[PDB]
Ligand binder design. Structure first.
Ligand SMILES: C[C@H]1CN(S(C)(=O)=O)CC[C@H]1N
Length: 460
């Protein structure tokens, strides 16, 4: 039985509105309804992994697990294995996988983050799951962010708290937050970003939705506009939205948006909005293709419609050679030429680099770089030709070209990371000087750049 080089992953997000689901929810898992939907000819083909995010979930874990497994069994005739389930208040994540994957999946981690302080601590936050699938690290975040049209800044703050404090993936990757720890990171939930149009335009918005004319609505979607101004979800992707706003519906129909202010809403309008979203971030030059992104039309127990997204994701095998793992392979090396970091920091301390990768036996610390002034104020940290020669555990190009090097630039004074980025070894050539580049971030915000040249030697 050969190891896969591709798997398909189903991501679902549903705010259930504290109501039990209807007896049939198979349309969700089949990516049927509005938007980018899945071909009928694929209906019996199981996804490799199903990741289900719920918000305002009134069910026990046991109750929801039985509905999800019986749903997938009716679709596929496959009895899925429970990889992980984690609940914070009414925010839940379930990960199910095909039984054939049980011994491909390891290093399962779960965590949660509670967002806000006092007033604002008690029901919003995030749950997450990570694991290895063969040689590929996968992370999944289900977040329920702050509600209300006038709280997009709060949502952006909730995002930064979640990516700073959610403890998933390889704890040895100590300078790196969840936005650098995974081959593929999927972040989804009731993110609660709204279509920011005047309240007096509610009926105009509804008109536009009935005409399936989303263009003038999406131009005011707070997640797209905040992303465009680099306020949130920097270096994440989202598929184009071609489905109607998923909030706020009258229950038991999809014929009516319930937008008017009510005691029950705290006297807030809920203009139709794309609250319910799926985004991802994969390492540079790894295959990831969105194959569906849409909403169901036939699940109406909640004031939200379920959202589905499906992805092709590149995966690698658990590589064994005669040499590594458990030693180096003298035939492999990674060299760096003409390298420099450009940092936004106003501070003047010395900096060194750390290189982290599962292709190394352990992380490597460089010598301090030489600080110079950029022509536009910037701090430029020059490494020239001084960076170490990295010794990968396996030299086979079929392994080494699929790997990545995480970089942290750390202060010599404090040993705190000022920026994190990632470099793909999927080079156009080996034994050849090639440009490399990554942006650097810290707490998910842009803090600088790293650029230079790489020279990769493999056993070929
Ligand atoms: C960075 C993405 C998404 N953005 S966006 C919606 O402005 O943030 C446009 C260009 C794309 N490469």
């Amino acid at each position: 039985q050969p190891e896969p080089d591709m798997i398909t992953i189903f991501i679902g997000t549903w705010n259930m509105g504290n109501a039990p689901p209807p007896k049939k929810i198979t349309s969700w898992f089949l990516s049927k309804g509005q938007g980018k939907t899945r071909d009928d000819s694929a209906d019996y083909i199981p996804h490799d992994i199903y990741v289900i995010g719920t918000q305002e979930d009134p069910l026990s874990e046991k109750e929801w697990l039985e509905i999800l497994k019986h749903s997938l069994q009716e679709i596929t005739s496959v009895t899925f294995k429970t990889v992980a389930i984690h609940t914070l208040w009414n925010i839940r994540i379930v990960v199910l996988a095909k039984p054939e994957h049980e011994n491909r999946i390891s290093h399962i981690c779960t965590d949660n983050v509670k967002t806000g302080i006092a007033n604002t601590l008690g029901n919003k936050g995030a749950v997450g799951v990570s694991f290895m699938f063969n040689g590929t690290s996968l992370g999944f975040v289900n977040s329920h962010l702050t509600s209300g049209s006038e709280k997009k800044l709060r949502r952006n703050q909730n995002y930064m708290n979640i990516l700073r404090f959610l403890a998933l993936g390889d704890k040895k990757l100590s300078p790196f937050n969840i936005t650098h720890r995974f081959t593929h990171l999927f972040w989804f939930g009731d993110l609660n970003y709204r279509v920011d149009l005047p309240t007096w335009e509610a009926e105009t918005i509804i008109q536009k939705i009935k005409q399936q004319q989303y263009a003038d609505l999406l131009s005011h979607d707070q997640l797209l506009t905040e992303r465009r101004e680099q306020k949130v979800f920097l270096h994440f992707e989202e598929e184009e939205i071609t489905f109607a706003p998923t909030y706020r519906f009258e229950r038991l129909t999809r014929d009516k948006y319930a937008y008017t202010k009510q005691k029950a809403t705290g006297m807030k309008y809920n203009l139709p909005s794309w609250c319910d979203r799926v985004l991802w971030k994969s390492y540079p030059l790894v295959h990831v293709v969105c194959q569906s992104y849409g909403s169901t039309s036939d699940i109406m127990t909640s004031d939200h419609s379920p959202v589905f997204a499906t992805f092709e994701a590149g995966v690698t095998s658990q590589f064994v050679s005669k040499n590594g793992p458990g030693t180096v392979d003298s035939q492999g090396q990674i060299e760096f030429l003409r390298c420099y970091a450009t940092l936004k920091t106003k501070s003047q301390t010395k900096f060194y680099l750390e290189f982290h990768s599962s292709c190394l036996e352990s992380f490597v610390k460089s010598q301090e770089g030489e600080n110079e002034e950029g022509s536009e104020g910037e701090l430029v940290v020059k490494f020239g030709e001084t960076l170490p020669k990295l010794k990968p555990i396996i030299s086979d190009p079929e392994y080494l070209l699929d790997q990545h090097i995480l970089i942290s630039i750390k202060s010599s004074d404090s040993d705190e990371s000022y920026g994190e980025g990632c470099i793909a070894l999927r080079l156009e050539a080996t034994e050849t000087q090639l440009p490399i580049y990554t942006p650097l971030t810290h707490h998910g915000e842009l803090t600088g750049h790293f650029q230079g040249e790489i020279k990769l030697q493999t056993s070929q």
